[PDB]
Design a protein around this ligand. Structure first.
Ligand SMILES: [Ca+2]
Ligand SMILES: [Ca+2]
Ligand SMILES: [Ca+2]
Ligand SMILES: [Ca+2]
Ligand SMILES: [Ca+2]
Ligand SMILES: [Ca+2]
Ligand SMILES: [Ca+2]
Lengths: 358, 358
């Protein structure tokens, strides 16, 4: 196995593809192409790079981090010559020489073979929007294992993501211009993060294939495959407040800064803040067990009945930071119901926070 | 106690002083048209003075430092901040943002012992920055020899000098300050060095230093920092500089750094040993690890001395090269079992000594 490639043509693939063999990358030279594969047994990334210089076929595995670090450590645009020599992989560029340990390509694990059952193509930016809108609301390491990921749902002509930690919920729906079967799957949280970072911000379309227990995403030279979480996800429809009758609109940043200052004097563990809404005015209060107290008053747009409501300010600040927009809509019912929060200029993403009695 | 100040006048002082629960509080004192703000940990103290141009009333209190800072920082650009002591709370008002903070009595706030200045001088901020940055990385970390955990500040002739060492490597930097100084040495603890550095805003305000038998004080602008000193017998750098390191090697600093950095990837993860082979206008760096992986770097250098080999902890060498912010480095060698001296090829202001490895 032999190949010579420019440093930069390896770095992006290396970043994407990054028991001992799990710490190695599979390298394969075949039919004019170097393939690089990383895996943790749950998910796998394959990156292809065209070989324009002379090369010789073959396959091995090499320590991922050390190989990455050597390549990154070489000078910008350096030529990197790689060949197998015995049980070692030789790396040479200029007068820099490296000899790395190998493990047999035969020992590199494959994900189980599977069949694609639902497929669609969408712009990368659309998938990025869907994931970014909801990612922060996934659970991390909850005993409810099915919350440690993101629901991907197809319905009519749209793709939807849902994330919840069992306390707050995020949902985002986007039309993708293709007739889809009604379907939903759970992508493990590590898989969501890996998928997100494979999206490079460019013009390559994204092709998604979903099987019974797997998902695959293809963008340009990269192919990501993950197991799905085998479980049942909560129904977001039952979480959204039914027909909320009271709408407040305010500048996102003004609202966020008011909440952020109030949060300083909220309970450190439970983070409860109170809202008092009246004609075109919002008052936010916070207090803590040391009996310190914050109050914020700001102009908003509101004409409904006067009401009060408490919430976890961390959850609300999470929403406002995710929204990054000009204006926000808080959809209210009463002191004993959840709130729905949206970009005032878009119904694509919605966020639900539970009420607190303070 | 009442004052009204522009946010912009409070922020930097609050950051500088904020950097027994009462140790979590700032002492605020309005007296003679000045607001003073003090923070302490019993070992060191920062005091900031703020001119009060708006109406004010005298008195003193203490308030939670982080909360007060976070509230002020959280307020908008150009906010006016009105503050008044009411009963046992401190009221903070700006626009329609209101905050009530807990207090502890000013009478409870601890003072450093009184002391007399024995040695005094003035120096540009840029000189103190240079002295600290040139040596700081070489201080010990939690060594049982406590004095090695800090930094020696030495006056000799008209020079101020810093020395830092952990027994394995040493840094020394000397700078002229244009004043006849006594011969004197003190050891500033780690945290004091960090603060000394933090107080240098980079402007044209000179620094005034006062040294007592057990304290150091630095005045810059409207800030006064005071630290206790560290007792103990700090090693003499003059005994550590090789007596006659007459084998001189010169090489590009970044070229040398990046070669060591690549070689380091395949060095022992705990011991970090690399080997240097010096010969006529050539340096070869090698590294190997228990897994029998190997790196080799060959660089052109300027060297006319006799051939020799020497082993080093590569992290120590990299630390030096990263601290040398320059074009060319000089390495001054003795033999395979003696320390190396390293300097900027174009300046003798700082020197670095690294012990060899067997
Ligand atoms: Ca280039
Ligand atoms: Ca629908
Ligand atoms: Ca569906
Ligand atoms: Ca294009
Ligand atoms: Ca209040
Ligand atoms: Ca010197
Ligand atoms: Ca070695």
């Amino acid at each position: 196995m032999k190949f010579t490639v420019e440093r930069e043509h390896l770095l992006k693939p290396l970043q994407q593809v990054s028991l001992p063999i799990l710490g190695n990358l599979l390298l394969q030279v075949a039919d004019g192409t170097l393939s690089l594969t990383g895996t943790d047994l749950e998910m796998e990334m394959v990156a292809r790079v065209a070989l324009v210089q002379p090369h010789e076929p073959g396959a091995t595995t090499v320590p991922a981090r050390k190989f990455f670090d050597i390549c990154r450590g070489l000078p910008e645009g350096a030529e990197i010559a790689v060949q197998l020599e015995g049980e070692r992989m030789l790396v040479r560029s200029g007068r820099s020489r490296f000899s790395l340990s190998t493990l047999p390509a035969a020992d590199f694990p494959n994900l189980d073979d599977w069949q694609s059952e639902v497929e669609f193509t969408l712009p990368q930016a659309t998938m990025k929007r869907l994931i970014e809108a909801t990612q922060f609301s996934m659970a991390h390491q909850d005993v409810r294992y099915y919350l440690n990921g993101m629901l991907f749902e197809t319905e009519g002509e749209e793709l939807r993501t849902v994330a919840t930690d069992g306390h707050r919920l995020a949902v985002c729906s986007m039309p993708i211009g293709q007739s889809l079967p009604s379907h939903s799957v759970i992508v493990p949280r590590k898989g969501v993060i890996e998928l997100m970072r494979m999206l490079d911000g460019g013009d390559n379309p994204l092709r998604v294939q979903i099987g019974s227990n797997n998902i695959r995403a293809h963008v340009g030279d990269f192919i990501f495959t993950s197991k799905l979480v085998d479980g049942r996800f909560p129904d977001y429809r039952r979480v959204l407040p039914k027909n909320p009758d009271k709408h407040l609109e305010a500048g996102c940043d003004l609202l966020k800064q008011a909440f952020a200052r109030a949060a300083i004097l909220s309970n450190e563990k439970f983070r409860g803040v109170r809202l008092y809404v009246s004609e075109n005015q919002l008052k936010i209060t916070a207090n803590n067990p040391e009996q310190e107290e914050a109050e914020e008053i700001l102009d908003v747009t509101y004409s409904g009945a006067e009401m009060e409501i408490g919430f976890n300010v961390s959850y609300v600040l999470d929403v406002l930071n995710a929204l990054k927009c000009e204006n926000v809509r808080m959809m209210l019912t009463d002191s004993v119901s959840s709130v729905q929060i949206e970009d005032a200029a878009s119904q694509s993403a919605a966020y639900v926070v539970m009420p607190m009695r303070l």
